[PDB]
Structure formats: C-alpha cells, structure tokens
Design a protein around this ligand. Structure first.
Ligand SMILES: N#CCC(=O)N[C@]12C[C@](Nc3cncc(Nc4ncc(C5CC5)s4)n3)(C1)C2
Length: 290
C-alpha cells in the first residue's frame, strides 16, 4: 500500500523538488498532519509557506489527497493559495502563499474582536463555504485554527485535510470527523450529514470570537461531545455584550435540526454582515502591532 500510495500521489502532484527555487527552509508551526516552514523565492525572496507531511505518520493516508486538490480546484479570494505540490522522499510538500497575520486562534485567545471584525471573518468564511458546498464538498474542520489572516486583514480558509464530498449516490457522509468542541450534534450522534455541519461549526467559531473559547472547552473531548449531543444550542457567556443582529445571525447557525439550519447561501444575505469592515480593520488585532 505504501508504495501503491506513493505512486498514486506522485501522479497528482507536480514533479521534482522545490529546492529548485526555494532557500531558507525554517520551521514555524506544527500540527497533527505535520510541520510547516517558511522558505524564500531564490530569485526575489518572496516568502512562501511549505507544509511537510509524512506519508507514513498519517492516521488516514487517503486524506492527503485533500491537502492538494481542494486548493487546486477551489481557488477563491478567501481560500489559501497553493502554488505547487511535491513528493520529497516520503513526505508530501505543499507550497502556499505565506499569510503574515497567522491563525485566527491567536487573536481570539489574546484580544476581544468587535462585531465589525467578526462580521468580516464571517463573510469571508461563508464565501469560501458557499462555493465548496455548491459542489458538495464539506469542510468538516471549521474552527479559528483553520482560518488565516494576511498582514492587510483579508481572511482565508485553510486546513482542508478533513474534506469530504457529496453527490446523488452518496448524499450524506457518515464519518466521525472534526474537532470535538466544533462538531455538529447530528455528526456526533452518528446521523448521516451534509454541509450543514460546517455552518454549526461556524457558529461555534463565532462563540470563539466573542467568549474566547467554544462551549465545554474545559471538559475532556468525549464528555464534551456527549454534552453537545444531549443539550440544547449553547449560550453565549457574553450575550449581554453582543448586538441583536449578531444574535439573530448566530441563532440561524446553532440550530440542532440541520434542515432548519441556515445555509451559507442564505446567510450571505443576513444583515449582520453589512457590519463587516475592510481588511484594514482586522490588522490591529495581529500580535505584531498589538
Ligand atoms: N498541521 C498544520 C497546520 C499548521 O501548523 N498551521 C500553522 C501554525 C502556523 N503559524 C503561522 C504563524 N503566522 C503566520 C502563518 N502563516 C501561514 N501562512 C500559510 C500557512 C500554510 C497554511 C499552512 S501558515 N502561520 C503554521 C499556522
């Protein structure tokens, strides 16, 4: 399988090895799928990001196809740009734009975003999610970690390893995939589900942006899942701090019944999002200048 797998993924990536154009490979980050470096473009010193993923250290090898194909087939102003992809020894390397502002997590833990910033992030992610979902691609790991910000405050969705796809032959998925505290109740209770699982996860991210963390963050994952499963839509701790409009918006997201749950298409027309500020309004929340 290992060699079968390598050969197959050799066919879906660009050939060769990007040392050809890149210098100064320095690690900066590190997730489960694996590490991340910056490198520079030898002829210009344009900075890229390179994610290095060991084909042998994966839990589900086949999820690696997503790391490449989602960014190649859904280019969009709110999706992280991929330049190329490669097999190097037995690592998959994906070269992407480097987004100087980091992940949304850094912000939501250290500062309190205003509604302008929140709407901005909400529009962004919904635009990406309208396009993926129009093609029947479910993201399945919407959270603040999954979101990157440029220096200039544009938002892009990242981390597509968990994507799955839906059609007429398989209209629902059935896998227990996602991050426990951001997982939809139908997903958790192992009911077949569609792209509505993203919208619930988007809600939970709004709660990040307002309260600093999602519900039951202090419970161990399996117990937390039990609670999302069993309890009603979670309350904002800082309810009293949010406008009627952010609440109107969030109530359309955290709906236990996925059918009553608003779609990304429906939500782009919500007036909560008129509130959305430029790229430049988000820029002060970055650790650099903050
Ligand atoms: N496993 C896993 C994922 C993981 O480790 N993600 C990171 C922690 C990181 N730290 C920072 C900090 N500041 C800026 C930045 N910019 C990025 N632009 C492009 C990037 C490529 C999308 C990968 S990452 N990345 C690497 C995000």
């Amino acid at each position: 399988s290992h060699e079968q797998f390598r050969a197959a993924l050799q066919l879906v990536v660009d050939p060769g090895d990007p040392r050809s154009y890149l210098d100064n490979f320095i690690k900066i980050g590190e997730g489960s799928t694996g590490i991340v470096c910056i490198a520079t473009v030898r002829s210009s010193g344009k900075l890229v990001a390179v994610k290095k993923m060991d084909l042998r250290k994966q839990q589900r090898r086949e999820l690696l196809f997503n790391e490449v194909v989602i960014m190649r087939d859904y280019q969009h102003e709110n999706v992280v740009e991929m330049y190329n992809s490669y097999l190097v020894g037995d690592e998959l390397w994906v070269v992407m734009e480097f987004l100087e502002g980091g992940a949304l997590t850094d912000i939501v833990t250290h500062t309190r975003m205003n509604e302008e910033q929140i709407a901005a992030v909400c529009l962004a992610v919904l635009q990406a999610l309208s396009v993926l979902h129009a093609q029947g691609v479910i993201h399945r790991d919407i959270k603040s970690d999954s979101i990157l910000l440029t220096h200039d405050g544009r938002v892009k969705l990242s981390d597509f390893g968990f994507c799955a796809q839906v059609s007429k032959e398989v209209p629902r998925r059935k896998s227990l995939v996602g991050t426990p505290y951001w997982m939809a109740p139908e997903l958790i209770s192992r009911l077949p589900y569609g792209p509505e699982v993203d919208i619930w996860s988007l809600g939970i991210m709004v709660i990040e942006m307002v309260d600093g963390e999602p519900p039951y963050f202090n419970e161990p994952p399996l117990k937390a899942m039990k609670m999302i499963r069993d309890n009603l839509p979670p309350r904002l701790k800082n309810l009293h701090k949010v406008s009627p409009s952010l609440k109107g918006f969030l109530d359309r997201l955290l709906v236990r019944d996925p059918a009553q749950r608003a779609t990304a298409a429906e939500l782009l027309k919500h007036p909560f999002l008129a509130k959305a500020g430029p790229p430049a309004s988000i820029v002060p929340l970055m650790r650099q200048n903050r």
